């Protein structure tokens, strides 16, 4: 069914709706129909909701949205179409939504964002999430056109195969950029386009085997999550990090790290904080000597407490002769 409170906040509580409820009026201020069985949105469904501020359609089976389905939604600020079955995106959907501050299109099976810029006029957008884990393979220069200031941009480009240079270059500022990408071949391509516009960069799922590194970066924090790394690739990645003059925070937690090359952190003189926890550190002595000693010398940098595999003792508590 669909229950609305006195304030116009409506929710599709039970998962049984086969389509958007009929008869919605100008009184509806929020519509959350997540986890239902909607598969199609027609032009008339939301035609009277001129005061709708949030539309959440997460996890439905939507595969078709008629061209002008959102025409009357000029008051819309939050739109979530995440995890549906949209194989292609239409710029006409976003044309009437200039007030948007949050847009989530994550989890839909589209290969690219389309042949037409989708966000050219979303001048108030703060959070944008696009991509998917298995089908998204290309990023084009026309994507993101129009976007100048963003608080958070999340791109799941797990299967990214192509990246048109300067695609991300047009955005003047992005506070937090999260990039999911399995391969590293396009990493430096993307890096040069965002080094001067991103404050916090987060790289997820990347296989860094065989990665090699050979300006005025403004990145202040770099986070790695679920990346595949080794002493050799960590050294190459550090060559890149060593070049970021103002790098203040480095998050290396959750990357299945077992060790680090001796002296790996010696050139990060401007670093203020480092995260090394949630990693199965091999605290056998010869191997862990550098890291244990480094944590004690730079006693104020570690955030959280890195622990040893097996014993679970703090890495900094290990002393090798
Ligand atoms: C998406 O649009 C492209 C270009 O028209 C088309 O080739 C593709 O089949 C569409 N995806 C599907 C199957 O919905």
């Amino acid at each position: 069914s669909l229950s609305c409170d006195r304030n116009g906040i409506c929710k599709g509580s039970s998962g049984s709706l086969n389509s958007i409820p009929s008869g919605l009026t100008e009184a509806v201020k929020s519509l959350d129909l997540s986890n239902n069985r909607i598969t199609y949105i027609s032009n008339s469904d939301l035609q009277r909701c001129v005061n709708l501020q949030a539309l959440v359609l997460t996890s439905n089976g939507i595969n078709t949205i008629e061209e002008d389905s959102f025409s009357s939604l000029g008051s819309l600020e939050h739109l979530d179409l995440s995890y549906n079955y949209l194989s292609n995106l239409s710029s006409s959907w976003f044309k009437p939504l200039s007030s948007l501050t949050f847009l989530n299109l994550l989890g839909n099976p589209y290969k690219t964002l389309g042949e037409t810029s989708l966000f050219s006029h979303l001048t108030k957008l703060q959070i944008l999430r696009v991509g998917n884990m298995d089908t998204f393979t290309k990023i084009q220069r026309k994507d993101f056109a129009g976007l100048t200031f963003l608080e958070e941009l999340e791109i799941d480009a797990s299967d990214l195969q192509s990246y048109e240079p300067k695609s991300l270059k047009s955005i003047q500022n992005v506070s937090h950029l999260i990039l999911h990408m399995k391969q590293h071949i396009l990493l430096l391509e993307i890096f040069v386009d965002v080094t001067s516009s991103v404050e916090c960069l987060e790289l997820r799922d990347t296989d860094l085997d065989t990665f090699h590194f050979s300006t005025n970066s403004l990145i202040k924090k770099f986070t790695f999550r679920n990346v595949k790394i080794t002493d050799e690739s960590l050294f190459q990645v550090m060559k890149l990090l060593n070049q970021i003059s103002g790098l203040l925070e480095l998050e290396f937690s959750r990357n299945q790290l077992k060790s680090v090359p001796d002296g790996i952190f010696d050139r990060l003189t401007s670093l203020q904080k480092i995260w090394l926890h949630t990693n199965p550190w091999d605290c056998s002595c010869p191997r862990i000597d550098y890291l244990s000693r480094w944590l004690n010398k730079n006693s104020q940098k570690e955030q959280g407490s890195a622990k040893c595999s097996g014993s679970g003792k703090p890495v900094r508590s290990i002393i090798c002769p």
Side-chain angles (χ1 to χ4, degrees):
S1 304
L2 178 71
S3 71
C4 302
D5 70 2
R6 64 176 202 168
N7 311 99
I9 303 174
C10 308
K11 295 185 180 183
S13 307
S14 59
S16 181
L17 299 176
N18 49 36
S19 62
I20 291 180
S22 60
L24 295 175
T25 71
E26 295 68 45
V28 179
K29 287 187 181 179
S30 182
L31 188 66
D32 186 330
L33 303 178
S34 59
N35 293 294
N36 276 278
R37 304 207 158 188
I38 302 168
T39 67
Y40 196 102
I41 301 183
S42 74
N43 292 154
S44 63
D45 285 339
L46 304 163
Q47 192 169 183
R48 299 178 56 178
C49 308
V50 298
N51 295 304
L52 186 69
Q53 294 180 298
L55 174 56
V56 179
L57 298 169
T58 315
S59 295
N60 271 273
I62 304 171
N63 59 55
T64 303
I65 296 173
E66 294 189 349
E67 193 175 4
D68 305 309
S69 297
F70 305 146
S71 62
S72 304
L73 313 189
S75 297
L76 202 66
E77 297 176 359
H78 181 109
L79 178 57
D80 197 321
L81 294 175
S82 202
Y83 299 97
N84 274 290
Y85 295 125
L86 284 53
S87 290
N88 274 304
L89 307 172
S90 176
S91 57
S92 70
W93 300 337
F94 312 112
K95 187 179 296 184
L97 313 180
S98 302
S99 297
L100 230 44
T101 62
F102 179 96
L103 179 54
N104 188 353
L105 304 169
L106 230 40
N108 283 281
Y110 47 78
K111 178 188 175 184
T112 69
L113 298 181
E115 301 186 303
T116 305
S117 292
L118 268 32
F119 327 116
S120 304
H121 297 275
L122 300 184
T123 317
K124 296 183 179 176
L125 196 64
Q126 303 173 183
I127 297 169
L128 176 65
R129 308 187 189 293
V130 298
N132 57 61
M133 194 178 94
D134 320 295
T135 316
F136 196 65
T137 60
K138 306 180 188 178
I139 287 170
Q140 312 161 299
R141 191 169 180 184
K142 47 192 164 190
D143 307 342
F144 316 124
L147 302 171
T148 305
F149 298 111
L150 253 40
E151 287 301 307
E152 191 166 307
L153 171 54
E154 180 168 4
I155 303 174
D156 182 345
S158 295
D159 202 15
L160 191 64
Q161 301 182 56
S162 175
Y163 173 77
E164 282 179 33
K166 305 292 183 180
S167 287
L168 292 171
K169 181 70 177 183
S170 48
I171 308 176
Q172 290 190 183
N173 287 70
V174 178
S175 302
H176 298 247
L177 169 63
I178 300 168
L179 182 275
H180 302 245
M181 187 171 69
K182 292 174 185 285
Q183 303 191 310
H184 68 71
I185 187 168
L186 299 170
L187 184 59
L188 298 171
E189 287 291 297
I190 293 171
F191 185 76
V192 296
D193 286 345
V194 304
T195 182
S196 295
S197 59
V198 176
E199 183 180 6
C200 175
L201 182 56
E202 176 166 348
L203 220 210
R204 292 179 182 174
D205 315 322
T206 318
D207 183 333
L208 296 172
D209 196 302
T210 76
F211 172 75
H212 182 292
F213 180 70
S214 55
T215 305
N216 49 285
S217 177
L218 307 186
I219 295 172
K220 300 299 192 61
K221 180 181 187 181
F222 207 132
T223 297
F224 297 81
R225 184 171 187 180
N226 196 43
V227 301
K228 298 172 177 178
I229 200 161
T230 65
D231 279 355
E232 283 179 31
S233 53
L234 214 205
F235 183 73
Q236 290 301 314
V237 171
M238 191 56 59
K239 290 175 68 178
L240 170 59
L241 301 171
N242 285 340
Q243 89 153 316
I244 303 175
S245 71
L247 186 69
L248 308 180
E249 295 169 34
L250 177 61
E251 189 163 28
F252 257 125
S253 55
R254 313 186 173 82
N255 295 294
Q256 280 295 278
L257 274 40
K258 288 174 60 171
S259 57
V260 299
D262 289 3
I264 191 69
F265 303 134
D266 296 355
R267 297 173 59 64
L268 297 177
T269 52
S270 290
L271 198 67
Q272 304 181 332
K273 301 180 171 183
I274 193 171
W275 287 258
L276 296 169
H277 66 79
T278 309
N279 283 123
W281 298 106
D282 174 355
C283 294
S284 57
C285 250
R287 203 175 196 179
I288 201 202
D289 193 36
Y290 170 74
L291 186 56
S292 51
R293 286 186 183 181
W294 186 91
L295 288 169
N296 284 292
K297 293 174 179 184
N298 299 274
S299 72
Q300 305 296 300
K301 302 196 177 190
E302 176 170 40
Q303 307 298 113
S305 179
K307 304 180 180 306
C308 297
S309 60
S311 74
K313 299 177 63 187
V315 173
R316 66 170 297 168
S317 77
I318 309 300
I319 302 86
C320 299

